[PDB]
Design a protein around this ligand. Structure first.
Ligand SMILES: Cc1cc(OCc2nnc(SC3CCCC3)n2-c2cccnc2)ccc1-c1ccc(S(C)(=O)=O)cc1
Ligand SMILES: Cc1cc(OCc2nnc(SC3CCCC3)n2-c2cccnc2)ccc1-c1ccc(S(C)(=O)=O)cc1
Ligand SMILES: Nc1ncnc2c1ncn2[C@@H]1O[C@H](COP(=O)(O)OP(=O)(O)O)[C@@H](O)[C@H]1O
Lengths: 576, 192, 125
């Protein structure tokens, strides 16, 4: 049957559910001699196709509890006045086979009322379901798990104490989980040796478990269409050996990925960033300060408690564009192995234009659920720029979105895990309330990368590309007196583009020769340009440009010295 | 432009539609097939966020058509219309020092309109001529103007006009050199 | 090349050691004007002069205490501008001309350019 092996994604909420349900189910007799209330209901919510029903079935099988599935529309499709009988009989039958697990798939259909509550019979169904759910006499060990797309879609009374008192957001699987899902979905098709499922997994961003299964099936169907159809040898049952002779090639998977259309790309991603400190070449003072502020409270919470100091839970990065603030935030999140949530400027601008700031509440709740997390508000000054910056609106710096963010931060800190990081290229226009204590008070300045930092940035950008050892990278980094990280990335991309164009043009001409003058003996000399050379980099650097002018760096230096530690205490000595 | 351009609104360049386009583009690239192409006659007022990496960063400047380009544009506009071989097209294209594609299209359309009006008026008169003086033997001489001639094009060019002034071309040249690749690396050589 | 020539011209009078690679200094100065290069050279000369005056003086001050005490050796503590003086000078290197006003100069040069479209002009054959 289905078990933990079938449950893919390694998303680490299956472990939480296990810890939740073993003792109530794995050790049911224990609770008989101990006075404790187990989890009467667990609400699994997330994007559709994430395997919530699969997870519930696997838990039921691995714990031995009698699994009962109450399909939402199955009862809803039944005639009014007798569907209530179906729900009551389902609970009674689950009660009989104690311990039992009752799974309500698509719970947002039985009790969708969000206090709007249209209709008459559906109100009866929701109220009777409430009576049954609250009617659990704590006898036996029936655990009621329900599936829902979002927590707010179901009736709020279902979310109350004793009905569904604890919720788990399965969420979209990540690259590691996408790879494991691909492995589980590719185990009987005799996958080819060339295909590794790693490149596909990385390119598979935005898919869900159902999406991964559909992509694998589409690749298999492409393989079946490409071969074994030309022969057209078919019978009632295709020969096992004949079908096994085919191997799903990388090309088939690539085409399937091109024909994927993932079912929820837009959904926000809660993922441990893969970026590491290696990608950023320097910022040692900044790196150490970030390590302090974030890592120290958790690695050594006892020492923070000993001195009675509450660590700051907000940091605001300020600096010129393209210097790596987003990368620095990702790296700091990676070092602590905490989930990273990034709120770019377009999202804030959308909330501001639409006059919908309640999304800030939802974003903060999501960050709270995925703890430990690093809630990063990238380019937080976007709203101020949108309203102006030199003259702006007649009013002050306060705006709806920033006010909601401040309210959530003030109401935050309770969680002890969410850490707010803010990045802004215009510190002058940022609202001052953002910098008050209890908010993003720790201001960190990210300067233009140094020569060593520039070398590291070039190496990180060119790690994947084949770069000839002849081209000296330290010389190029030193040559770039004030290039930003974005400028270095542009130079590397232009060099790669030049190399690609030269290689394409050359092999195309070489193919004309073969066609124009058919050679008697075929002897390919391989690639005329196998790796990026000095001339490519020289031509690319010919177009190198400094995006960040020295005047805006001067303004940042002004603000930095606008956070000046006075000028009279530098020699402070105690009287002794 | 709708919000202004010289003074505009009190706020910045950000607007609802461009913000949504940016959000979709940021959430795009997954498909690996859709390619976004943007055309703008006022690059100065375009939102800078549009040009950030991952967005429409590759800026391409389309200059006024050259003499050869003008000849090609005239040929394309006049491919369907019956044009007499007598009217030299290269001379007309070269004559138009700074005409835009729209200006050349207008010149061709005006020439065609003049030819159509002349043909209609002529055959109408010729029909009066049979009605007024019924000829004993019917012998139509066909069309008095079967194709566009030199005189039609000369009259049309008489009204030729340059829609695009040289000052707006100067502003575009400014922006183009506002994407200037520095002035110190042109001789960059690796140490060897 | 112009920067190298300017540096050589400024330092012709001053005694500069052959070990200092002036071409490297010229190439490292990305967009320094002639005034900036002259300022760097003057600062290097000033650093050399200050070091020579302090070292010769402090040596004489110690030596004068004992009459005829140390040998009569005629030492020159700094007889030429050294490399360290050039690093000392470059620490204070400054870019006088911002890229924005260079932008303005190139803008005026473009406005003065001979319009466009007459490059291909050719008399009829
Ligand atoms: C002991 C303590 C821990 C704490 O929390 C620690 C923590 N855990 N997970 C996280 S989050 C995760 C880590 C990486 C990404 C985010 N954190 C945390 C807390 C603050 C800042 N960054 C992280 C708070 C406050 C206290 C205390 C201090 C003084 C006193 S008294 C009365 O003066 O003696 C009483 C209580
Ligand atoms: C190989 C590849 C193809 C691609 O897509 C190609 C593509 N197909 N249809 C289209 S669209 C259609 C064409 C005409 C109208 C539009 N495209 C496409 C892609 C980009 C721009 N224009 C077209 C993307 C990205 C990659 C890659 C590059 C580096 C690495 S690594 C880890 O550094 O080794 C991994 C993956
Ligand atoms: N991590 C996974 N491992 C194996 N199958 C998965 C996984 N995630 C999703 N699936 C596929 O999703 C299909 C249906 O999705 P489901 O489990 O019912 O979630 P939901 O009810 O939210 O749509 C299942 O048949 C299963 O094959």
């Amino acid at each position: 049957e289905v078990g933990y092996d079938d449950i893919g994604g390694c998303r680490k909420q299956l472990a939480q559910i296990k810890e939740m349900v073993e003792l109530p189910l794995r050790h049911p007799a224990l609770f008989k001699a101990i006075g404790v209330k187990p989890p009467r209901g667990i609400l699994l919510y997330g994007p559709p196709g994430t395997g919530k029903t699969l997870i519930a079935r696997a838990v039921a099988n691995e714990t031995g509890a009698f699994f009962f599935l109450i399909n939402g529309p199955e009862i809803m499709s039944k005639l009014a006045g007798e569907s209530e009988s179906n729900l009551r009989k389902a609970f009674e039958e689950a009660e009989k086979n104690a311990p039992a697990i009752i799974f309500i798939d698509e719970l947002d259909a039985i009790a969708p009322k969000r206090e709007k509550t249209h209709g008459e019979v559906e109100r009866r169904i929701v109220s009777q379901l409430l009576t049954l759910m609250d009617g659990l006499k704590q006898r036996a060990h029936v655990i009621v798990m329900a599936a829902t797309n979002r927590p707010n879609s179901i009736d709020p009374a279902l979310r109350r104490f004793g009905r569904f008192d604890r919720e788990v957001d399965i969420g979209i699987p990540d690259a590691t989980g996408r790879l494991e899902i691909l492995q589980i979905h590719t185990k009987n098709m005799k996958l080819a040796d060339d295909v590794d499922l790693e490149q596909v997994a990385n390119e598979t961003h935005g898919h869900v478990g159902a999406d991964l299964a559909a992509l694998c099936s589409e690749a298999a169907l492409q393989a079946i269409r490409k071969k074994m159809d030309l022969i057209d040898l078919e019978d009632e049952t295709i020969d096992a050996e004949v079908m096994n002779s085919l191997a799903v090639t990388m090309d088939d998977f690539r085409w399937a990925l091109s024909q994927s259309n993932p079912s929820a790309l837009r959904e926000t991603v809660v993922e441990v960033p893969q970026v590491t400190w290696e990608d950023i070449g320097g910022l040692e003072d900044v790196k150490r300060e970030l390590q302090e502020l974030v890592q120290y409270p958790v690695e050594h919470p006892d020492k923070f408690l000993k001195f009675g100091m509450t660590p700051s839970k907000g940091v605001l990065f300020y600096g010129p564009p393209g210097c790596g603030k987003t990368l620095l935030a990702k790296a700091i999140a990676n070092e602590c192995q905490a989930n990273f949530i990034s709120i770019k400027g377009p999202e804030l601008l959308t909330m501001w234009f639409g006059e919908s700031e309640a999304n800030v509440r939802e974003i903060f709740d999501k960050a709270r659920q995925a703890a430990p997390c690093v809630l990063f508000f990238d380019e937080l000054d976007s709203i101020a720029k949108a309203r102006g910056g030199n003259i702006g609106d007649g009013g002050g710096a306060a705006d709806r979105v920033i006010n909601q963010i401040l309210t959530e931060m003030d109401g935050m800190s309770t969680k002890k895990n969410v850490f707010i990081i803010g990045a802004t290229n215009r510190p002058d226009i940022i609202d001052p309330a953002i910098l008050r204590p209890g908010r993003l008070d720790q201001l960190i300045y990210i300067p233009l990368p140094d020569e060593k930092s520039r070398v590291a940035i070039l190496k990180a950008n060119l790690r994947k590309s084949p770069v000839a050892k002849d081209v000296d990278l330290e010389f190029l980094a030193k040559m770039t007196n004030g290039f930003s990280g974005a400028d270095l990335t542009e130079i590397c991309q232009r060099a790669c583009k030049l190399a690609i164009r030269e290689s394409i043009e050359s092999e195309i001409r070489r193919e004309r020769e073969r066609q124009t003058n058919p050679s008697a003996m075929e002897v390919e000399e391989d690639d005329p340009v196998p790796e990026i050379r000095r001339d490519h980099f020289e031509e690319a650097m010919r177009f190198a440009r400094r995006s960040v002018s020295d005047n805006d760096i001067r303004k940042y230096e002004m603000f930095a010295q606008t956070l000046q530690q006075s000028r009279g205490f530098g020699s402070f000595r105690f009287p002794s | 432009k709708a919000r202004g351009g010289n003074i505009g609104d009190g706020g910045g360049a950000a607007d609802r539609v461009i913000n949504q386009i940016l959000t979709e583009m940021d959430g795009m690239s997954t498909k690996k097939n859709v390619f976004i192409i943007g055309a703008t006659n006022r690059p100065d007022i375009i939102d800078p966020a549009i040009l950030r990496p991952g967005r429409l960063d590759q800026l391409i400047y389309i200059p006024l058509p050259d003499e050869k380009s003008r000849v090609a544009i005239l040929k394309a506009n006049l491919r369907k219309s019956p044009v007499a071989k007598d009217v030299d097209l290269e001379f007309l294209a070269k004559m138009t020092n700074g005409f835009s594609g729209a200006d050349l299209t207008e010149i061709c359309q005006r020439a065609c309109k003049l030819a159509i009006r002349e043909s209609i008026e002529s055959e109408i008169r010729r029909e009066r001529e049979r009605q007024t003086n019924p000829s004993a033997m019917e012998v139509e001489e066909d069309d008095p103007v079967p194709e566009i001639r030199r005189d039609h094009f000369e009259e049309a060019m008489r009204f030729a006009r340059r829609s695009v002034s040289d000052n707006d071309i100067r502003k575009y040249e400014m922006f183009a050199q506002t994407l200037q690749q520095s002035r110190g690396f042109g001789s960059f050589r690796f140490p060897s």
